[PDB]
Amino acid sequence: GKGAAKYGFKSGVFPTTRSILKSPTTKQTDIINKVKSPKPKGVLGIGYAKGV
Amino acid sequence: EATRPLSKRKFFAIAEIIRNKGQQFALYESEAQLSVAKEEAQKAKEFLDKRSVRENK
RNA sequence: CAUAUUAUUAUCUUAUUAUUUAUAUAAUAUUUUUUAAUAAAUAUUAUUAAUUUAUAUUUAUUUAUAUCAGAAAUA
């Protein structure tokens, strides 16, 4: 009963709604640009360095 | 950084070295040894020379 | 001192199974060398069943490894 306060006081659960499109579409320019953008270099980034 | 399982307990791999302090700590060690040897030799030569001067007196 | 149950093992025994060895006048398929029984025509010539032969798929047999579970020892 307590935890329901987080979820709008609704008791019970619905199954998680499924996404019709599992992967992003090619018309989403922003997602492609973020994907294609140069990866941040170094440790605050996400990728292996040039020499390593 | 996350990686495929490479062993029972290893699941990460290094990607880059922001700070090379550990690398420098050995280069400086060897350089210090080499420089200390020659500086020792020079100062020992000076001390021997001074001993010779006081022997002459 | 006595009873009990899990766990293990440089020990003993081992169902079944998994690989792994070696053997089969062992089979079955097909490939030969051949023997009988049979079919059409003017000595046959081929056919099916059995003989020998060497490639597969297994069966019996045993070599090793592991292995349920049981004892023996320990905790």
Next chain:
RNA sequence: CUAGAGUAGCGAAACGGAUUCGAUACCCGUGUAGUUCUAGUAGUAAACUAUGAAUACAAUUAUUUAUAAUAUAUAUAUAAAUAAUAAAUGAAAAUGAAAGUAUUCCACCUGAAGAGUACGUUAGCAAUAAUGAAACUCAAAACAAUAGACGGUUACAG
């Protein structure tokens, strides 16, 4: 306690003398270990300020104590020790530059008894030291202070 040496006094234990209803005690005598030195073991005390360490701040007075001056005199200034306090804090006693106002870290406590006991483990030559419960019983248990009673409690008077 373990080895050596030492051993004048003192003195566990022991042996006797007194006292006592009884003396196993206080008093008295002889007095062993020990106290002493060297080389070790051990790591416990009411090992106490019953008050861990560090930092910033916090109103006075009085002494000293230690420096720095200025000419014994400036009842000279700067520090710390000590004593009494203000505020503050505290159950109060009381603390008083910490028991105050704050910050940081560590150790410790969760009713009395059972109990620092049992069992186990670690270390020591050993005595022992460290760590350390549980069941059961109970509504108790303790601290400060108040007013009494009491003391083989003091002094003053009559």
Next chain:
RNA sequence: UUUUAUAUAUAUAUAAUAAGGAAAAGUAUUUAUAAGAAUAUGAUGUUGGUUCAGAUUAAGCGCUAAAUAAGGACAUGACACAUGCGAAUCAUACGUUUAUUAUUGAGAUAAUAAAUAUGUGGUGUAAACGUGAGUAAUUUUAUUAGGAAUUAAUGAACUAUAGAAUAAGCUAAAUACUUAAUAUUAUAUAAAAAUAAUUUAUAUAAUAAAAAGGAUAUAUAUAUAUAUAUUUAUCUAUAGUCAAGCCAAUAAUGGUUUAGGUAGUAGGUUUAUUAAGAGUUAAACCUAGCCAACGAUCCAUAAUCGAUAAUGAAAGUUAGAACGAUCACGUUGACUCUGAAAUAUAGUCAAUA
């Protein structure tokens, strides 16, 4: 103050001088909400425990009890089970059996009716249901806008599209089984960049892996075949949907009076196996490592959780019955076939009854 004067050696001592005065009327939502009491004491204050006032239950019991409506109902022995049911269905897969009519002469074949699921076959029982023994994590639970090895020429079973559905054998016959025919990856060339690799296109290599017919009608011809059409089936390919396999991070009870533990142990290099990484398993060769007083290893206990239940002002605490999610199990242990996925409530072996 500031500036300047005189005097004295840029500076020093004395004296004078000072710019800061502006005025005016009118122009709620406040939030969340924590109460103590009795018992010490000769009496007082404080520490301190004990008990009580509230709510609730998977409840039990004593006394009592009218009806209706709804929600629950072996928490303990995962102890043993008499008895009846809980998984069948298809006659349009193949076979059988009858009865009538017709032609053919004990039967034969058609048409029409039926029976036949004690014969051969297809589909369904990996689900649902119940349970909580094991499990403190070596594969379990929760969570992430987490990943890759950058997961298979996997469809399980529906949708959308295209194709194909051939021959023999053995079954008594087949949509039963075998044999056969036919229908992504690895290389090479370039391209780019989301690049120190991946992707894209091409060209080859092999992909190369299948199938099945029934029920009706008709149309041909010569009962036999055949050819269509309608229905229901079969196989392959692409995509979708639903799904699976593996790993990462954080959290998950008590006892160190369990202080050392670990030798596949920690890591490296290869090989076998998988769709797939890895001492996961099997083999080989190297290094000496790995965890641990922020608690290893060992032991005991326990299914886990929620937008579930109880309680509290709340943080939290307890439960895990009921509703829901995950896991594990179907008397116990191991292994094997099938399969995409099972150590299956299957099979084999053993243990118990």
